[PDB]
Amino acid sequence: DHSELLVNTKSGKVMGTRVPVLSSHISAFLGIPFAEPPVGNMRFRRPEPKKPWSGVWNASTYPNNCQQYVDEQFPGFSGSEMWNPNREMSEDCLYLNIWVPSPRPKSTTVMVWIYGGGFYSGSSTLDVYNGKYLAYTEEVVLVSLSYRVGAFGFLALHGSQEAPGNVGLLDQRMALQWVHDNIQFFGGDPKTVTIFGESAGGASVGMHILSPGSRDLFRRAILQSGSPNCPWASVSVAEGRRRAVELGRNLNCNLNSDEELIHCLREKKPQELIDVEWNVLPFDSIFRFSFVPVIDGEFFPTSLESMLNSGNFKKTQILLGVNKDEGSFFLLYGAPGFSKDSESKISREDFMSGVKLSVPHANDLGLDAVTLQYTDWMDDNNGIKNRDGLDDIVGDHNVICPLMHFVNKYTKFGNGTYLYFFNHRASNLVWPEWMGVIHGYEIEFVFGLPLVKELNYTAEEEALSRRIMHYWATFAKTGNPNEPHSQESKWPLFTTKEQKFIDLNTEPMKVHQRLRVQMCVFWNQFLPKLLNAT
Numbered sequence: 001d002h003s004e005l006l007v008n009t010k011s012g013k014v015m016g017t018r019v020p021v022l023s024s025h026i027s028a029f030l031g032i033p034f035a036e037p038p039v040g041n042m043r044f045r046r047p048e049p050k051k052p053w054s055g056v057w058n059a060s061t062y063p064n065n066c067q068q069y070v071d072e073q074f075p076g077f078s079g080s081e082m083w084n085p086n087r088e089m090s091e092d093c094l095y096l097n098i099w100v101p102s103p104r105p106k107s108t109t110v111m112v113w114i115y116g117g118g119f120y121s122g123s124s125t126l127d128v129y130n131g132k133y134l135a136y137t138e139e140v141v142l143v144s145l146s147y148r149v150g151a152f153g154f155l156a157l158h159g160s161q162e163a164p165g166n167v168g169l170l171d172q173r174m175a176l177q178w179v180h181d182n183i184q185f186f187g188g189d190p191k192t193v194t195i196f197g198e199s200a201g202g203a204s205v206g207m208h209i210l211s212p213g214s215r216d217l218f219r220r221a222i223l224q225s226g227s228p229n230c231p232w233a234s235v236s237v238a239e240g241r242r243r244a245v246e247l248g249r250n251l252n253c254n255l256n257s258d259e260e261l262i263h264c265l266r267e268k269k270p271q272e273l274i275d276v277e278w279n280v281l282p283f284d285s286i287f288r289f290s291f292v293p294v295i296d297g298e299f300f301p302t303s304l305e306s307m308l309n310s311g312n313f314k315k316t317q318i319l320l321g322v323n324k325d326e327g328s329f330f331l332l333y334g335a336p337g338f339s340k341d342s343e344s345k346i347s348r349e350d351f352m353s354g355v356k357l358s359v360p361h362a363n364d365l366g367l368d369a370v371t372l373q374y375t376d377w378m379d380d381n382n383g384i385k386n387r388d389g390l391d392d393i394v395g396d397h398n399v400i401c402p403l404m405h406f407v408n409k410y411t412k413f414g415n416g417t418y419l420y421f422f423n424h425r426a427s428n429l430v431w432p433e434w435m436g437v438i439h440g441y442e443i444e445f446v447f448g449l450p451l452v453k454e455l456n457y458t459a460e461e462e463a464l465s466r467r468i469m470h471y472w473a474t475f476a477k478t479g480n481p482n483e484p485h486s487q488e489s490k491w492p493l494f495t496t497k498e499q500k501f502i503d504l505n506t507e508p509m510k511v512h513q514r515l516r517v518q519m520c521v522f523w524n525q526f527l528p529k530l531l532n533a534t
């Protein structure tokens with residue numbers, strides 16, 4: 001038995017399937033197990049490596065998606081539905097997927113995609129994460145992994161080895177171990193693995209850069225609209241403890257010991273956990289999630305900010321950036337006065353309420369500083385300015401400014417930073433105009449969807465996708481997104497002194513400096529000082 005669709009790995013033999021892509025074909029190996037099913041009494045534990053198997057693992061179909069909350073705010077609307085599980089859910093969900101050029105390469109660049117979803121949702125199997133276009137067009141081996149989300153991935157009772165926290169990040173790490181150990185059999189070079197992801201996936205990428213136990217498993221990294229230091233992406237062990245206890249309380253559990261709490265939570269069916277998980281948040285807010293990574297002293301040896309300041313992280317090249325209207329999604333879903341089928345002009349009063357929801361940690365003085373920094377006092381009742389102002393508050397506070405802080409710290413010690421600002425509003429977007437360039441909507445350009453006629457993008461969008469795909473792949477290959485010696489415009493390196501970045505859109509490249517500095521000085525220096533003093 002020796003064929004293109006048959007691969008022998010250290011865990012055993014695997015059978016792929018041949019897959020059409022833009023008038024050609026490539027191989028796909030879908031649903032490969034990298035870990036033991038984390039079911040029964042393994043619920044909440046560290047993952048275990050998958051036991052090698054006899055025979056041939058059938059990898060022709062997508063695996064199950066992890067157990068997660070399902071978005072029903074817009075039943076049947078494609079814009080929301082493109083993010084929900086398109087496969088059955090199960091706790092048996094630790095699989096990865098691989099798309100390989102045909103003919104099988106010998107030793108080519110590997111890209112491993114880590115999905116977002118606020119650490120409580122996400123799937124490797126979504127249509128927007130289909131690796132075939134990028135594998136095919138850029139001649140890379142494209143992997144996507146999966147990882148436990150919600151309580152299953154992130155319930156944390158520090159001190160306990162039954163539910164220690166961060167096990168979803170350990171799931172990701174185990175897949176990356178598997179790729180390190182086995183991708184060579186698929187034609188990938190384990191020495192040139194780029195990890196990439198968006199949102200919590202981007203945060204996850206930054207987290208593997210920081211964690212000593214993950215760093216050696218990859219060469220380079222791309223972070224899309226997420227940063228490990230984002231306010232939503234981690235909590236203290238005391239806060240983790242609190243939430244787990246509270247989750248127990250919502251389920252009539254026995255709170256007397258870690259063991260009694262865990263035993264009870266292990267008896268529950270998955271949906272029972274998911275039905276009450278949104279009831280454990282400390283504040284009334286938006287852009288905050290229930291079970292997330294914990295600063296535990298192990299996966300993360302000290303606080304994220306101390307790791308960044310001292311240079312305790314992997315030094316390599318990174319390519320990263322943000323979308324123009326990162327806040328709009330979260331306002332739609334979580335804040336009063338924003339709705340899908342209206343222009344969502346906002347009163348002064350739904351503004352003040354938006355602010356309080358957006359910065360739950362802030363005292364009154366704090367809320368006043370935010371309000372002043374984002375209100376045009378010559379025109380304080382323009383419902384549009386208020387809407388846009390809140391959009392910018394959410395985006396700047398939760399995504400952009402944390403990313404800019406990560407960038408400036410990393411770049412001091414790292415070996416090459418490329419920064420972008422994606423500001424192209426897709427011509428076939430189904431969400432309303434007010435939402436602008438939405439969190440998550442660069443992905444489709446990164447995975448090459450606009451090259452598919454039927455999906456109704458313009459030609460200039462096809463070209464923008466090809467250009468982005470080629471920057472990301474060239475970067476994964478070399479640590480630099482620019483082709484040596486081509487005549488195209490050059491994406492310059494981001495340096496501590498000059499802080500250059502480019503826009504990503506259908507217009508001639510333009511280079512700028514100091515991405516939102518005015519607001520990021522407010523969010524990164526002034527406001528935390530205000531809140532620590534008062």
Ligand SMILES: O=C1C(NCCNc2c3c(nc4cc(Cl)ccc24)CCCC3)=CC(=O)c2c(O)cccc21
Nearest residue numbers: 071083116117118199287288329330333334439440
């Ligand atoms: O991640 C979600 C979230 N996930 C389900 C929606 N999925 C979307 C995702 C992304 N962008 C979206 C953009 C829109 Cl407009 C609607 C849903 C989106 C990019 C990251 C992958 C997930 C739902 C939420 O209500 C939510 C909040 O209310 C607050 C923070 C985060 C989330």
Ligand SMILES: *[C@@H]1O[C@H](CO)[C@@H](O[C@@H]2O[C@H](CO)[C@@H](O)[C@H](O)[C@H]2NC(C)=O)[C@H](O)[C@H]1NC(C)=O
Nearest residue numbers: 315316317411413414415416417479493494495
């Ligand atoms: C990334 O790291 C490499 C070295 O590991 C840097 O290249 C070196 O540059 C130093 C200082 O100019 C020279 O003395 C060496 O000749 C170089 N070594 C090699 C192998 O080229 C490179 O500059 C770094 N890039 C950035 C942007 O920091």
Ligand SMILES: *[C@@H]1O[C@H](CO)[C@@H](O)[C@H](O)[C@H]1NC(C)=O
Nearest residue numbers: 015016017057058059060061
């Ligand atoms: C592999 O199994 C899947 C699972 O339903 C099936 O759809 C497909 O026809 C099978 N192919 C092979 C080669 O076994």
Ligand SMILES: *[C@@H]1O[C@H](CO)[C@@H](O)[C@H](O)[C@H]1NC(C)=O
Nearest residue numbers: 078428430453454455456457
């Ligand atoms: C492309 O456009 C047509 C015509 O307006 C529409 O019916 C179709 O649903 C579109 N296809 C997709 C995938 O959106």
